[PDB]
Amino acid sequence: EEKEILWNEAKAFIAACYQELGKAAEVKDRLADIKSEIDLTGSYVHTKEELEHGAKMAWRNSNRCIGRLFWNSLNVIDRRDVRTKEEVRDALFHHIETATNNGKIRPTITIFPPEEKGEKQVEIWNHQLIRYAGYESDGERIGDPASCSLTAACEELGWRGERTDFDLLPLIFRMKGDEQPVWYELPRSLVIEVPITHPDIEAFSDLELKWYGVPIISDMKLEVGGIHYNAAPFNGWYMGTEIGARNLADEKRYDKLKKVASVIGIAADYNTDLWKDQALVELNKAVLHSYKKQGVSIVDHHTAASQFKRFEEQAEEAGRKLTGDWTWLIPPISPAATHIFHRSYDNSIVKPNYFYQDKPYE
Amino acid sequence: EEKEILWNEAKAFIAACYQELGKAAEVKDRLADIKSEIDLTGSYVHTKEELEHGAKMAWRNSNRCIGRLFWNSLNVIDRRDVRTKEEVRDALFHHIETATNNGKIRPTITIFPPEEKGEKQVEIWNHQLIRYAGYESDGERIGDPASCSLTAACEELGWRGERTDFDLLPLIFRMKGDEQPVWYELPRSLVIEVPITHPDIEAFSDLELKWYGVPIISDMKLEVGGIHYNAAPFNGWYMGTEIGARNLADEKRYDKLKKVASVIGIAADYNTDLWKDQALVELNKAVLHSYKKQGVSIVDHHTAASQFKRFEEQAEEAGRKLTGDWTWLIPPISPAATHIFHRSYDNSIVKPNYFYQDKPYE
Numbered sequence: 001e002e003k004e005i006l007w008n009e010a011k012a013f014i015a016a017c018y019q020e021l022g023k024a025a026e027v028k029d030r031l032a033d034i035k036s037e038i039d040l041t042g043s044y045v046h047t048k049e050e051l052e053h054g055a056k057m058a059w060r061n062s063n064r065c066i067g068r069l070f071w072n073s074l075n076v077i078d079r080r081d082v083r084t085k086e087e088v089r090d091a092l093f094h095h096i097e098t099a100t101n102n103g104k105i106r107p108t109i110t111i112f113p114p115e116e117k118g119e120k121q122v123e124i125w126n127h128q129l130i131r132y133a134g135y136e137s138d139g140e141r142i143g144d145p146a147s148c149s150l151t152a153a154c155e156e157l158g159w160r161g162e163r164t165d166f167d168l169l170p171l172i173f174r175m176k177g178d179e180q181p182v183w184y185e186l187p188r189s190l191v192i193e194v195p196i197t198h199p200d201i202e203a204f205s206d207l208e209l210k211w212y213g214v215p216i217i218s219d220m221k222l223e224v225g226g227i228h229y230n231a232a233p234f235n236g237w238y239m240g241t242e243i244g245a246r247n248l249a250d251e252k253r254y255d256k257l258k259k260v261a262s263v264i265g266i267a268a269d270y271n272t273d274l275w276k277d278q279a280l281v282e283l284n285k286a287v288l289h290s291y292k293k294q295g296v297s298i299v300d301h302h303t304a305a306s307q308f309k310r311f312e313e314q315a316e317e318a319g320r321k322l323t324g325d326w327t328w329l330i331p332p333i334s335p336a337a338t339h340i341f342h343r344s345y346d347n348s349i350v351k352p353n354y355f356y357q358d359k360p361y362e
Numbered sequence: 363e364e365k366e367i368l369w370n371e372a373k374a375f376i377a378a379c380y381q382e383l384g385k386a387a388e389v390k391d392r393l394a395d396i397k398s399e400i401d402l403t404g405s406y407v408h409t410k411e412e413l414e415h416g417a418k419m420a421w422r423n424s425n426r427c428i429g430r431l432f433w434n435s436l437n438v439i440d441r442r443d444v445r446t447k448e449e450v451r452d453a454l455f456h457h458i459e460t461a462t463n464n465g466k467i468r469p470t471i472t473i474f475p476p477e478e479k480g481e482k483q484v485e486i487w488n489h490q491l492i493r494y495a496g497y498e499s500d501g502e503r504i505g506d507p508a509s510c511s512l513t514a515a516c517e518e519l520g521w522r523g524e525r526t527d528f529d530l531l532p533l534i535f536r537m538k539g540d541e542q543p544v545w546y547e548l549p550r551s552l553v554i555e556v557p558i559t560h561p562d563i564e565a566f567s568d569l570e571l572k573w574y575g576v577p578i579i580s581d582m583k584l585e586v587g588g589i590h591y592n593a594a595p596f597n598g599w600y601m602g603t604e605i606g607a608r609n610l611a612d613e614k615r616y617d618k619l620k621k622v623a624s625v626i627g628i629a630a631d632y633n634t635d636l637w638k639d640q641a642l643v644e645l646n647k648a649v650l651h652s653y654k655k656q657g658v659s660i661v662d663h664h665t666a667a668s669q670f671k672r673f674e675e676q677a678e679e680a681g682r683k684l685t686g687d688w689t690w691l692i693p694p695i696s697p698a699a700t701h702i703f704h705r706s707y708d709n710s711i712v713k714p715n716y717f718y719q720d721k722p723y724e
């Protein structure tokens with residue numbers, strides 16, 4: 001069955017991919033090659049064209065992603081050649097550098113060797129390549145609570161955080177054959193961060209908030225034509241609400257709404273005053289203002305929804321079915337001010353796509 | 363099959379209802395009575411206890427309703443005795459009066475005779491008993507665009523609106539046997555309205571906004587034990603976001619966000635300024651402030667979500683499965699500031715319940 005699963009997925013992907021690339025005539029011969037290759041080796045190897053277009057299709061098929069208008073401009077870096085942890089580390093360093101691009105963020109994915117027999121060649125432990133540590137002990141809460149389990153795992157391996165609210169976690173990954181992952185501290189020169197200030201409320205800087213420029217998701221599996229690329233970190237730029245309405249706002253994250261209320265000069269005492277809503281607006285204004293002022297790419301939710309509308313239109317014009325997850329596509333503030341809220345979406349799963357996979361720790 | 367559908371639904375409802383009422387012992391005999399009655403007449407008649415509890419269960423089962431904590435305190439008015447249009451009209455007038463209760467709103471439902479052979483005895487045309495007219499002609503848009511089709515239908519029947527932005531539509535309903543519905547102007551003394559002012563922005567009154575106190579949904583079918591009560595208007599009080607984030611905010615409703623932005627002194631030019639979000643917060647603050655100041659019941663979305671959390675807990679403690687529609691339960695502003703956003707809900711349909719039915723016009 002496993003071989004057959006591979007072959008069925010391969011057939012489907014190659015036909016669709018080559019059709020999109022105007023390579024329909026080459027489908028028959030390529031399929032035979034793949035079929036022979038699966039018979040002889042138990043798998044097959046993507047051409048660079050297949051890999052690149054596969055990663056793009058996967059983004060295009062990501063139901064939960066509002067940023068899909070730009071799917072075809074994804075920068076795909078083929079690192080199926082890596083064999084050593086130094087090569088992996090350097091590839092991750094490089095991804096950070098080239099994706100960051102001095103603040104003009106380039107949507108980028110680096111693709112490492114795929115699983116062989118369900119056996120990972122490279123196993124990335126980070127949730128994002130750049131993320132803050134979190135600590136919890138004896139009433140004391142420091143940093144990002146979402147990172148507590150990974151932080152504890154790193155500290156088991158000899159890493160030690162300074163215990164600021166914004167410690168950069170090291171890169172941490174394991175190679176096939178090794179019992180333990182290795183870790184490497186991030187060079188600060190590679191990591192752009194943005195201090196959060198408000199366009200007209202001077203006291204906002206008293207909160208000493210900041211966030212990192214580039215979100216680089218590194219724990220999802222890219223599946224293309226039955227091949228499982230468990231290690232394939234990708235990035236875009238942020239939508240502002242991710243930072244201002246979730247990372248800094250959530251009670252189980254940085255939980256800053258009461259402090260925001262205080263610095264903007266409103267009471268945080270009565271639900272009917274809508275102080276949380278007001279704090280959310282000002283914090284989100286501050287986030288967009290700060291990224292723009294520094295020259296780090298970001299998009300607001302209104303602009304992002306407008307871009308997504310064009311993606312919907314483009315899909316229709318191309319004769320492609322549109323899939324989406326309404327519950328993730330609506331922004332977490334003012335959702336009914338976007339067109340997304342007022343329509344429905346088919347949440348069917350189409351491949352290629354990006355998938356969750358079990359954590360290697362905890 | 364139709365008889366059998368009735369009998370199956372009856373069996374299920376009576377067992378559950380009587381179990382909840384501690385009347386489990388009386389189930390067997392009541393079922394026989396009903397069974398005989400269905401054989402002889404093609405239907406059956408609810409006891410007042412069954413009717414009252416049925417309407418309450420229906421609210422309790424309404425997946426989309428955040429206000430369900432208070433399901434058991436619904437005031438059920440049995441008007442299965444009405445036979446004339448004057449009796450219907452007076453019953454609707456009465457519902458308005460008693461539900462309004464000088465502003466201390468009482469959740470209330472008035473139940474009219476049920477469908478006989480799918481044949482309605484009373485057919486209500488209004489979407490809500492109290493709602494504003496809408497007009498569209500030659501570039502000119504007046505009032506509530508959502509009411510345009512019903513307004514046009516009323517004007518076919520000899521009613522004429524003053525064409526303010528807030529004309530009260532007449533009650534309009536049809537009796538079995540009549541080709542045309544009848545209409546009756548609402549006595550203004552029965553209709554409480556609230557002018558919208560802001561707690562600290564004096565200019566907000568320049569917008570001359572207002573809304574009606576009591577939303578009374580009159581176009582849904584109450585289904586209890588296989589009986590179809592197509593005419594059974596019900597009300598609660600408003601959650602503030604319904605008025606401030608939808609009725610007054612939606613581009614296809616009153617579309618007031620640009621005007622709100624102007625009176626609160628912010629530019630409405632750049633998406634990144636989040637002026638729509640800011641306008642939404644101030645408009646929603648104004649709505650809550652105004653209803654509270656006048657002494658008309660209303661609930662904010664934070665308080666409503668907290669009440670819904672208790673409903674969830676109460677359901678668990680009672681051994682009842684919880685059903686809900688996440689997409690309607692989240693409020694349309696700051697949804698991620700509520701617990702609802704961060705969990706999932708089973709959207710299964712349980713009866714008794716309230717259902718959509720086709721409009722008798724358009």
Ligand code: HEM
Pocket residue numbers: 055058059062064065066067068070074107108109234235236237238239242299304328354
């Ligand atoms: C270019 C800018 C991009 C923006 C602004 C953007 C925006 C977003 C946002 C806001 C989410 C939802 C996260 C949340 O609500 O918590 C999301 C989800 C997602 N995006 Fe994008 N995205 C972009 C690019 C990309 C790229 C380049 C990829 C992959 C090649 C991608 C794949 C995804 C996936 C897989 C998810 C869902 C994650 C999950 O299910 O947990 N996006 N995107």
Ligand code: HEM
Pocket residue numbers: 417420421424426427428429430432436469470471596597598599600601604661666690716
């Ligand atoms: C007591 C105060 C109540 C509040 C604050 C409340 C709140 C709400 C809200 C906010 C909605 C969603 C509307 C929207 O988002 O557009 C809703 C839906 C609903 N409520 Fe309640 N509700 C209350 C009482 C009731 C009562 C008394 C009933 C019936 C006996 C009821 C039945 C429903 C139904 C059927 C819906 C769904 C309508 C649809 O699917 O179109 N609610 N409620």
Ligand SMILES: N=C(Nc1cccc(OC[C@@H](O)c2cccc(NC(=N)c3cccs3)c2)c1)c1cccs1
Pocket residue numbers: 215216217234235236237238239242327328703704
């Ligand atoms: N947003 C939700 N859940 C949620 C909860 C906790 C964390 C979380 O992180 C998304 C984070 O892992 C993530 C994943 C994918 C993309 C992003 N954001 C980005 N801009 C990009 C990262 C990489 C490419 S684009 C961020 C998402 C919900 C919607 C409805 C109910 S709950």
Ligand SMILES: N=C(Nc1cccc(OC[C@@H](O)c2cccc(NC(=N)c3cccs3)c2)c1)c1cccs1
Pocket residue numbers: 341342577578579596597598599600601604689690
């Ligand atoms: N809220 C949504 N849709 C929507 C669109 C237009 C009108 C509308 O009116 C609800 C209105 O008919 C209605 C129905 C039932 C209850 C209420 N509000 C109330 N407080 C009550 C009326 C009667 C008892 S409680 C109001 C709802 C959506 C959620 C997610 C995607 S779209």
Ligand SMILES: [Cl-]
Pocket residue numbers: 215242247
């Ligand atoms: Cl994030």
Ligand SMILES: [Cl-]
Pocket residue numbers: 577604609
């Ligand atoms: Cl309404």
